[PDB]
Design a binder for this molecule. Structure first.
Ligand SMILES: O=C(Nc1nccs1)[C@@H](c1cc(F)ccc1O)N1Cc2ccc(-c3ccc(N4CCNCC4)cc3)cc2C1=O
Ligand SMILES: O=C(Nc1nccs1)[C@@H](c1cc(F)ccc1O)N1Cc2ccc(-c3ccc(N4CCNCC4)cc3)cc2C1=O
Ligand SMILES: Nc1ncnc2c1ncn2[C@@H]1O[C@H](COP(=O)(O)OP(=O)(O)NP(=O)(O)O)[C@@H](O)[C@H]1O
Ligand SMILES: *CCC(=O)N[C@@H]1CN(c2nc(Nc3cn(C)nc3OC)c3ncn(C)c3n2)C[C@H]1F
Ligand SMILES: [Mg+2]
Lengths: 294, 293
């Protein structure tokens, strides 16, 4: 339990390059230098923007231990932490980056089999979090990391103590209610991001006005590639009654069914000239970059 | 089977830095660039020196398919091959490098628990090769790679198609390579570790090694070894190959000693060096070593 989170010294790692920032901190590509060794191991470091105290660090560590305890192929695990004035968190470096930027950059080369399997994998990761009784609270295409093109993992979950209005359920925007069913709403928006190849939700609508349009029944529009089958699932994630939305267990089953006949459910120009990697290319990826069980 | 070896194009990988030289080639640090992608993935690439032909490239492929088929935590797997003028072989990059240089560079910080566990892991990999009926033929501290300090893996095995001072007497005299002649090389490999990377028979010409072996000379007892460990090494160097221990037996014996390491190795400073905590091991595995055992 306690051994799943490594406490690092300042002197055993170095930030080398800025990767981006968001709302809670700046993420760096970094290097871990094991004591007494000559190797340099790449890591990802998030330095929280707000400085904290030793007593606030007790809060940080209590949540850090929980996020260091996850064990699922599609959920990222927090690996380490270094406390000072500013808190630095350490996890595995994902060279492919986040799924949002990945789909924007590869939008003319992503076929139906990839998109639906990513939907399955995110639902598998979310179902694990629900099983562990951990609410994500910030699910979005930007918080799905690409380990390999065939394998995505959820990150930045459970930040209860630390707003993405356009990804939040109506009950979260108004009354600050965060449940696994409000995550299902965020899952719907994330799927919309993938199927629009990285479009911005409610583009040009100020965040302060999102709750009004949701109450009047407006929802994100049907993406051009989505059949009605897929759009019905997205819409059901955005029902105003949280208990009427699908469960992550059901989303796994439904998207897995569609993944077994992907061109029936997504209409993409060029779909027959793109496929999943052959077993050869998957074995090569996994041996070099992805040796975990699944 | 066939899908375990990836055939790469010249245009999808690049050699960036020379790491050293091995069997039949120079091993380089490389980068794999997946087609249609922007990432660069580090690999280790060996470009065969004596260049080859398309008909000869078939012999290479038949052996490559077997070395791409190994599935054991302590045995390195061949991942890819690029059939160019010179044939280049692709596998996972081990930033820690080989165990021989590692023990030389960390010789004042390596405790008994690491040394005995390294012996266990090499024996596990060699027992695997025996189970697959693959004779290594070149086992040595140089052909044991460090994935993490806690996890070593055997490489460059099965190159049937000379390391005299690691060879069993029957290999030197008669070119007989069996799993029992590997046991001899394993004994020498353990000797390299326990001496913190000393050269075996230092200063004796290779052309005279078989003579000294026939007269009964063997590598001397390393200073840190108790007699229990040295007796095992000596039993690996018996002239009767069938009298040498089996890798299955070496696993059991070294694992027993690994459960009480300071009883079997006497190292100055041993009580101030230990294995990594579960904390440090989980950190290593998540970053560098996500494979099972
Ligand atoms: O480190 C993460 N990302 C990374 N990106 C790149 C490199 S590291 C993710 C993260 C990474 C994962 F891999 C998996 C889950 C996860 O959540 N974390 C972890 C984390 C732990 C604790 C806290 C925390 C708790 C309390 C407080 N307050 C309370 C009120 N005022 C005083 C102090 C502030 C911050 C935040 C986070 C966080 O953002
Ligand atoms: O690639 C390896 N090392 C690496 N270092 C760094 C990056 S890759 C290991 C290696 C890697 C493993 F993962 C496991 C075992 C192993 O041996 N190989 C593999 C290999 C395959 C084939 C051949 C081969 C066979 C026959 C011929 N003849 C045929 C008849 N006409 C004349 C020429 C030439 C070359 C050699 C090797 C070899 O040296
Ligand atoms: N382990 C990682 N490896 C590589 N890039 C990462 C990693 N973790 C996060 N990033 C990226 O680093 C950038 C900045 O991180 P972050 O501060 O979380 O921004 P963000 O995720 O887009 N905003 P947020 O909604 O709070 O998660 C984003 O592009 C992340 O996708
Ligand atoms: C110890 C004997 C030796 O040097 N053999 C050479 C190098 N080998 C080798 N090395 C690595 N990793 C490595 C070595 N150095 C100096 N830096 C690195 O990593 C950046 C390696 N990874 C995978 N393979 C197959 C390797 N081989 C073997 C001989 F080339
Ligand atoms: Mg994030």
């Amino acid at each position: 339990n306690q051994a799943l989170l490594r406490i690092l010294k300042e002197t055993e790692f170095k930030k080398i390059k800025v990767l981006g920032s968001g709302a809670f901190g700046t993420v760096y590509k970094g290097l871990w230098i094991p004591e007494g060794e000559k190797v340099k191991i790449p890591v990802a470091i998030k330095e929280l923007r707000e400085a904290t105290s030793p007593k606030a660090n007790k809060e940080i560590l209590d949540e850090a231990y929980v996020m260091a305890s996850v064990d699922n192929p599609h959920v990222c695990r927090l690996l380490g932490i270094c406390l000072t004035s500013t808190v630095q968190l350490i996890m595995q470096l994902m060279p492919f980056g986040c799924l949002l930027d990945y789909v924007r950059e590869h939008k003319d080369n992503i076929g139906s089999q990839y998109l639906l399997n990513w939907c399955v994998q995110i639902a598998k990761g979310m179902n694990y979090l629900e099983d562990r009784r951990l609410v994500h609270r910030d699910l979005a295409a930007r918080n799905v990391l690409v380990k390999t093109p065939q394998h995505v993992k959820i990150t930045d979950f459970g930040l209860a103590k630390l707003v993405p209005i356009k990804w939040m359920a109506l009950e979260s925007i108004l009354h600050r209610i965060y449940t696994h069913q409000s995550d299902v709403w965020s899952y719907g928006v994330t799927v919309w991001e993938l199927m629009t190849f990285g479009s911005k939700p409610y583009d040009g609508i100020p965040a302060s006005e999102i709750s009004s349009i949701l109450e009047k029944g407006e929802r994100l529009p049907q993406p051009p590639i989505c059949t009605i089958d897929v759009y019905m699932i997205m819409r059901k994630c955005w029902m105003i009654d949280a208990d009427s939305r699908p469960k992550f267990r059901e989303l796994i089953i439904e998207f897995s069914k569609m993944a077994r006949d992907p061109q029936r459910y997504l209409v993409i120009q060029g779909d027959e000239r793109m496929h999943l990697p052959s077993p050869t290319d998957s074995n090569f990826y996994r041996a070099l970059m992805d040796e975990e069980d699944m």
